[PDB]
Amino acid sequence: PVVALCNTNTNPELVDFIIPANNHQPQSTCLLMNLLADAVAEAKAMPTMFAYKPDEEIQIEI
Amino acid sequence: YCRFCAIGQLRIDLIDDLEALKRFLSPYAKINPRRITGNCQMHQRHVAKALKRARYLALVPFVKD
Amino acid sequence: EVKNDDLELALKKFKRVSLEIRRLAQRHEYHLRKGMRLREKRKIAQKKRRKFR
Amino acid sequence: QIDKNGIIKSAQLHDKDVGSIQVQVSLLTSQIKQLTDHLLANKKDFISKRGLYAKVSKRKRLLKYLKHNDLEAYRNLVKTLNL
Amino acid sequence: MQYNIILLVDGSLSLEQANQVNEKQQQTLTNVEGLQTEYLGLKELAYPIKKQLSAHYYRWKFSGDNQSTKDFKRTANINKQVLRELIINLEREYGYLASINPKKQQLALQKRAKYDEIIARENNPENPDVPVTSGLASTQPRLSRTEKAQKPKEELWDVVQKMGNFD
Amino acid sequence: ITTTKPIKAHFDPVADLLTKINNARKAKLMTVTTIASKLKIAILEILVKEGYLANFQVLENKSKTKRIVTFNLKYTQRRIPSINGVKQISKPGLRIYRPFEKLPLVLNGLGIAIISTSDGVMTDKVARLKKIGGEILAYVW
RNA sequence: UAUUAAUCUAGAGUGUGGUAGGGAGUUUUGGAAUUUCAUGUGGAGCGGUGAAAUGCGUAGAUAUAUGAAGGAACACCAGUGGCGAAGGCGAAAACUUAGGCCAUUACUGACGCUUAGGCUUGAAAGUGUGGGGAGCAAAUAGGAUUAGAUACCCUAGUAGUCCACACCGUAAACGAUAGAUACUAGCUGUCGGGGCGAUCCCCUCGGUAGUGAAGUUAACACAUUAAGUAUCUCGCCUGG
């Protein structure tokens, strides 16, 4: 299998696990990537960073 | 932009707006393309017919070079 | 033609309008049929649309 | 001109029916009378002849439908002779 | 129906003779005379008509029967004192219904919108803002009544797990 | 409920309802509306009470002029249609009948069919049980 | 299912209101333009070709100002335009009129699809009667092309090329999709009506266009104007 950050208009039949969130814009992609990294980071006995911290994420573009 | 799609004068003849017809008239007594009239079909055919009307009545020259 | 009052701007206008006149003349020295007429009419329409689109 | 407003009120069975069969056949025969003169005037207006063929075919269909379903289908013959 | 008639005069003659010949042409009408008397002064033609350069243009509009037109056609052409013969009944696309004409506000909106009075106003057409009337009533309502009782089912998306038990 | 749009019978009851079944099976939809008819009522109820599609309702307008029926098809969370193919052997101009001895089976282990002999709708198994032959509606699988 | 008596409107038409379109014919004209004939200007060339020839040319050619005569087609708006059963329909009208479209909350009630037979038109050419031959140009001739010029260009020129009567019915008369009732992903551009309501867009009923799912077709490719799944009626295919 494989999981996909499913942007709308994509084929759902190819994908097996659907993540319906924006990915063309970076402001959502950064948060989603950080969340999935935190989800996978528990395997190392290394504590998570986000999803439990009240501090807001960073975003810088120009 | 079209002068005639926005006001809705609903009738075209020689004494509705003759100076508008002159503005629509070319410098060489012709008819301007779609890029000037600002519309596609119906006010355009109206003004073309009216310019022909005045042409037959000799309100604007057939040719003027 | 008219409007010859500038050394070169009027010249540019004159040459452009004369090129238009020549193109309008190009369809008036040979024989053609109605279907052929519709053919170059559609071709010119498509070419101008590609010029603008 | 056919003057529909003047002929609608002359073949009716009620005071509100406007789509009855009798008013339909009256309209059809009025069109026949008008367009016969029109075609005998203009002998090359063939689209008009096709349209007249269409209305006469429709009138024949209506007459057949009446003569099939309803016995009372010959009031319009005694006033305007047909067939 | 109503008609629109344009009439011409020969040469640069006086105005009284023009009115007289206009009146003479008017009596040609078969049964109905609802003439309107006005003229466009004097305008110089851009090209000669027969041999002249200027003439008087007169206008008429009456409401009568359609037979009042052919007589003018064989009379005006016979009269050598006319130069043009425009005769239009009504058949250019026209509207007079009293539900569309009361819309001249556009013009009232137009000039003020485009008139330049302050250096701060910046406007350009072809701009969408979608003013809302809050109600259209164009929905074609059709209600129904149920006559049998059965139970429907809810639907979700086809979420598939590839055996989910590799452990 | 209150679809607020008109529907009409297309050409003929049997093929009219089979067209909507075709639409259901190919478009992978849920609810399809159509007009009502006693034959369609009977076939829908015999088809649903044997467990082959979802439920359906019969509806009527404000005035006693028109009766319509909508129908739903059984589906699964796995998104699998319950119908694989429908085909009518009888068609306008071809009304073929069978006797009891020659009753056409329908891929015996799988298929379902309706035979209108004399009493509305009877499925193939009860048709054999009563030993009566009639007019075969269509094959569904 | 037939057969049947009465039925009820959504099928289907008719009325009402709005709206659109080079739809058809008839009758009047207008322009620029070509050709020709004239009145003045001028003197050796003018008209054609990968290069040259036929032809015209002091009985002032060409060019050039004006006039006069006349036959055909209606530049310009004319577009991814609109109607038309098909072909087609573009200068201006008046007339008789033809079919739509949209809300049809009105009217009647199955009258609706097809229809081999029978009729209505029919791109062009040609045929037989009147105008005209202004331009055009099959055929014929003359001059060059190559062994060859009945064709390839130039000069004229034969009827026809239009308007009226009677024909003849063939077109690659093409969307190479017979004609109607259903439904089905979307997306974009574009014409009309309704309300909305400056143009700008929001929807609905519709037609005209591309893009492109499943699905289909051998493939190309088709798709909300099916070649998809259905169904109905007339025709055609059984090898050149």
Curated annotation (Swiss-Prot), chain A:
Domain of life: Bacteria
Family of this protein: Belongs to the universal ribosomal protein uS2 family.
Protein name, as recorded: Small ribosomal subunit protein uS2
Naturally occurring in which organism (per UniProt): Mycoplasma pneumoniae (strain ATCC 29342 / M129 / Subtype 1)
Swiss-Prot record, chain B:
The protein's assembly and partners: Part of the 30S ribosomal subunit. Forms a tight heterodimer with protein bS6.
Keyword Isomerase: no
Family per similarity comment: Belongs to the bacterial ribosomal protein bS18 family.
UniProt keyword annotations, A-Z: Ribonucleoprotein, Ribosomal protein, RNA-binding, rRNA-binding
GO biological process: translation
Species the sequence originates in: Mycoplasma pneumoniae (strain ATCC 29342 / M129 / Subtype 1)
UniProt gene name: rpsR
Function of the molecule: Binds as a heterodimer with protein bS6 to the central domain of the 16S rRNA, where it helps stabilize the platform of the 30S subunit.
Keyword Cytoplasm on entry: no
Superkingdom of this protein's organism: Bacteria
One function term, GO molecular function aspect: small ribosomal subunit rRNA binding
Gene Ontology CC annotations of this record: cytosolic small ribosomal subunit
Record's protein name: Small ribosomal subunit protein bS18
From Swiss-Prot, chain D:
CDD domains noted in UniProt: Ribosomal_S15p_S13e (cd00353)
Function comment: One of the primary rRNA binding proteins, it binds directly to 16S rRNA where it helps nucleate assembly of the platform of the 30S subunit by binding and bridging several RNA helices of the 16S rRNA. Forms an intersubunit bridge (bridge B4) with the 23S rRNA of the 50S subunit in the ribosome.
MF term (GO), any: structural constituent of ribosome
Gene Ontology cellular-component annotations: cytosolic small ribosomal subunit
GO process terms (BP): translation
Gene (name only): rpsO
Official protein name in the record: Small ribosomal subunit protein uS15
PROSITE patterns linked to this entry: RIBOSOMAL_S15
Top-rank taxon, per record: Bacteria
Ribonucleoprotein among keywords: yes
Gene3D superfamilies named in the record: 6.10.250.3130, S15/NS1, RNA-binding
Segments traversing the membrane: none
UniProt subunit comment: Part of the 30S ribosomal subunit. Forms a bridge to the 50S subunit in the 70S ribosome, contacting the 23S rRNA.
Family: Belongs to the universal ribosomal protein uS15 family.
Record keywords, A-Z: Ribonucleoprotein, Ribosomal protein, RNA-binding, rRNA-binding
InterPro entries per the UniProt record, alphabetical: Ribosomal_uS15, Ribosomal_uS15_bac-type, uS15_NS1_RNA-bd_sf
Organism for this UniProt entry: Mycoplasma pneumoniae (strain ATCC 29342 / M129 / Subtype 1)
Curated annotation (Swiss-Prot), chain F:
Molecular function as annotated in GO: rRNA binding; structural constituent of ribosome
Keywords of this entry: Ribonucleoprotein, Ribosomal protein, RNA-binding, rRNA-binding
Keyword Cell cycle attached: no
A cellular-component GO term for this protein: ribosome
Cross-referenced SUPFAM superfamilies: Ribosomal protein S8
GO BP annotations listed: translation
PROSITE patterns associated with the record: RIBOSOMAL_S8
Matches recorded under Pfam families: Ribosomal_S8
Transmembrane segments: none
Record bears the keyword Hydrolase: no
UniProt similarity note: Belongs to the universal ribosomal protein uS8 family.
Assembly and interaction partners: Part of the 30S ribosomal subunit. Contacts proteins S5 and S12.
Role description: One of the primary rRNA binding proteins, it binds directly to 16S rRNA central domain where it helps coordinate assembly of the platform of the 30S subunit.
PANTHER family on file: 40S RIBOSOMAL PROTEIN S15A (PTHR11758)
Name of the molecule in the record: Small ribosomal subunit protein uS8
The organism's taxonomic lineage, starting at the top: Bacteria, Bacillati, Mycoplasmatota, Mycoplasmoidales, Mycoplasmoidaceae
Name of the encoding gene: rpsH
